[PDB]
């Protein structure tokens, strides 16, 4: 391939009637930089026109649309697929070259494009057109399944996925996607050994993707109160063994190293974690996980001013306006002023899309409690804010009452609101103390403004 | 059928699952395994 690169830039500058020279240029460029492939196709489109005004074969045009698919040029990628299908139609008699099959994969690409338009209606149309004419194909059979997976798991999503194994049980991609469905059901955690054992046949092995999935379903077992019972210690070392195995078979996997750093961070080695995550950090920043795991270390050194910025940097993806666990992992030991009131604003943003959470309404009660005790104790503060303080702690007591009546918690019962209730009662006493001080500061500001009134009369 | 081998031959895969996990740079694991052994030196 490097010698191919050398010969290709031995001939690209040349022209011994170069025709396909750009075709086999870009034919290796698809692994490499895509823009080089674009440029090769660009003059390759021209070069088929001067010797004779010959229409570009649709395999070229489909592939350049395929390039623009991973680029921002989605619309003219669609135009490329349209004119590709037309040129295949212009290959009226070419069942030797099988323009029909080329149209099949072209339509597959165009349906994948309609998915990028989020035109899932026409994506459904193209997919069912292909499957009604070539039902032996699997990728269309499961992208349809993936589309309904975006709607949900127990749809015909899961059933297209299972029948994709029924048409092809040898198919590792679909078979992986079977257990990918089961990632939604984490209560089907220990059951995933079987549904990720089926193609641990060694024809499929080695499957890095699946064995990292084993490591991941093995790590979600952690953060339980049974580590002291050596159970999660064994789980940590078993995940470590998986990670050593994927380490030896691949040094350059990055999700592996994320897994090693995660399990050792669960082992309490957080100074020993930011380094290993730093490696995958330069390797590629575009892994959503490592953004979180680094800031967990930062807040473990209480480095909030290094952490929350990178949290909202993780929020710079076009995925979800209020991801819940990220603002949870944001509001952890947040103790300064913006770490209190803007913390409340973040909790309100989360609560706006997630008013169902008991933990979130507990945590807003907690942060309201913190800001209430921040304004009534050594304060000696404004009238209006301590007037808001009594209302906000009253609200906090409403949530203390409300959550305590609820049974289910985050597997830790929140009768801890009761000591908050004794607190807020003594906070009522303190507020009745300090509101008198508020009236005192009001009357003294009245007397000093009288004192300036008299002297300005004197002037 | 003939369509299956007819399509899977003529297309190409430049983007698979497995090399997503593998990093596009060169991040070896000796440094990783060295600190793996180093934490074992604390053990």
């Amino acid at each position: 391939r490097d010698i191919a690169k050398g010969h290709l830039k031995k001939v690209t500058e040349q022209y011994p009637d170069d025709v396909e020279a750009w075709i086999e240029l870009a034919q290796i460029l698809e692994q490499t930089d895509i823009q080089g492939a674009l440029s090769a196709y660009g003059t390759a489109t021209r070069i088929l026109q001067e010797k004779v005004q010959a229409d570009v074969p649709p395999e070229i045009l489909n592939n350049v649309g395929a390039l623009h698919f991973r680029l921002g040029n989605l619309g003219e990628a669609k135009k490329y697929f349209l004119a590709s299908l037309d040129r295949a139609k212009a290959e009226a008699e070419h069942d030797e070259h099988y323009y029909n099959a080329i149209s099949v994969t072209t339509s597959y690409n165009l349906a994948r494009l309609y998915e990028a338009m989020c035109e899932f209606h026409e994506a459904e149309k193209l997919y069912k057109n292909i499957l009604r004419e070539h039902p032996n194909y699997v990728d269309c059979y499961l992208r349809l399944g993936a589309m309904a997976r975006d709607k949900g798991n127990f749809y015909e999503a899961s059933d297209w996925f299972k029948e994709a194994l029924q048409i092809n049980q040898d198919h590792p991609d679909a078979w992986s996607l079977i257990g990918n469905l089961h990632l939604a059901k984490q209560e089907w955690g220990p059951g995933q050994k079987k549904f990720e054992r089926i193609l641990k046949q060694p024809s499929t092995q080695s499957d890095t993707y699946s064995m990292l999935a084993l490591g991941n379903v093995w790590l979600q077992t952690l953060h339980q109160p049974t580590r002291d019972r050596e159970k999660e210690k064994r789980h940590q070392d078993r995940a470590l063994a998986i990670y050593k195995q994927v380490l030896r078979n691949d040094a350059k996997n990055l999700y592996a190293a994320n897994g090693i750093g995660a399990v050792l961070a669960h082992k309490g080695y957080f100074r020993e974690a930011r380094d290993v995550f730093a490696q995958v950090r330069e390797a590629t920043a575009d892994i959503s996980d490592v953004w979180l795991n680094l800031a967990h270390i930062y807040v473990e050194q209480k480095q909030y001013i290094s952490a929350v910025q990178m949290y909202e940097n993780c929020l710079r993806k076009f995925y979800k306006h209020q991801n819940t666990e990220v603002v949870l992992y944001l509001a952890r030991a947040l103790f300064k002023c913006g770490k209190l009131q803007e913390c409340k604003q973040t909790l309100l943003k989360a609560r706006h899309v997630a008013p169902s959470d008991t933990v979130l309404m507990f945590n807003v009660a907690l942060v309201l409690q913190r800001l209430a005790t921040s304004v009534l104790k050594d304060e000696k503060s404004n009238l209006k804010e301590v007037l808001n303080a009594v209302k906000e702690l009253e609200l906090a007591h409403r949530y203390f009452s409300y959550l305590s009546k609820v049974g289910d918690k985050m597997r830790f019962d929140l009768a801890l609101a009761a000591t908050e209730a004794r607190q807020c009662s003594d906070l009522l006493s303190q507020a009745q103390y300090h509101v008198a001080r508020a009236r005192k500061q009001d009357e003294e500001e009245r007397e000093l403004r009288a004192k300036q009134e008299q002297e300005k009369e004197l002037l | 059928v003939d369509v299956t081998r007819d399509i899977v031959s003529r297309e190409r895969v430049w983007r698979t699952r497995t090399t997503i996990l593998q990093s596009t740079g060169k991040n070896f694991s000796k440094n990783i395994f060295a600190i793996l052994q180093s934490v074992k030196a604390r053990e």
């Binding site: 395929a66 080329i102 690409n109 790590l219 999700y255 945590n363 005790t373 | -």
Partner: peptide
């Protein structure tokens, strides 16, 4: 205050799905 905010802190790890690059004839 007396204790920090509660969380089920986990160093989770996500997986990319299958890419399905548009094909190259």
């Amino acid at each position: 205050e007396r204790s920090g905010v509660v969380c089920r802190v986990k160093y989770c790890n996500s997986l990319p799905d299958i890419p399905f690059d548009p094909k190259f004839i």
